Amino acid sequence: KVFGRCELAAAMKRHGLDNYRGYSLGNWVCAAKFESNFNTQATNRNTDGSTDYGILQINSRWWCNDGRTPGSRNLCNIPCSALLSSDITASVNCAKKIVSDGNGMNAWVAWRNRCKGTDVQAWIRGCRL
Numbered sequence: 612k613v614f615g616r617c618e619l620a621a622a623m624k625r626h627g628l629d630n631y632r633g634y635s636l637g638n639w640v641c642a643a644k645f646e647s648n649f650n651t652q653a654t655n656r657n658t659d660g661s662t663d664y665g666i667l668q669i670n671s672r673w674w675c676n677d678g679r680t681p682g683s684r685n686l687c688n689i690p691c692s693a694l695l696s697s698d699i700t701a702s703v704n705c706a707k708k709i710v711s712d713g714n715g716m717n718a719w720v721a722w723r724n725r726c727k728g729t730d731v732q733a734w735i736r737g738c739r740l
């Protein structure tokens with residue numbers, strides 16, 4: 612599924628991401644835009660052999676099992692394919708684990724390089740929430 616901007620903002624709010632670990636909703640929408648272009652089916656293979664999955668491009672080296680990343684962990688205890696669903700529950704629950712890991716949203720490279728330090732509230736402006 613390719614989400615609209617305000618549609619994703621509302622879904623992320625219903626799943627409890629607004630101000631989760633201190634990160635306002637616009638941070639999460641910004642991160643999703645530049646990680647996946649709001650596409651739940653996005654996948655990208657990395658040079659180390661791992662793959663990023665879903666709307667927040669969660670990586671198979673640490674967070675999910677895809678059966679082809681040897682020596683990796685599965686810290687969210689999910690198959691990576693669950694992160695491609697049109698329902699974002701699995702991606703949101705796993706993202707909550709990641710952002711609590713100590714480095715906040717700096718775990719997402721696109722957030723650090725394209726969202727951090729910008730007016731992220733612009734990403735939810737005009738939405739009915």
Ligand SMILES: [Cl-]
Pocket residue numbers: 632633714715716
């Ligand atoms: Cl933080």
Ligand code: NA
Pocket residue numbers: 671672673674675676677680683684685
């Ligand atoms: Na894994």
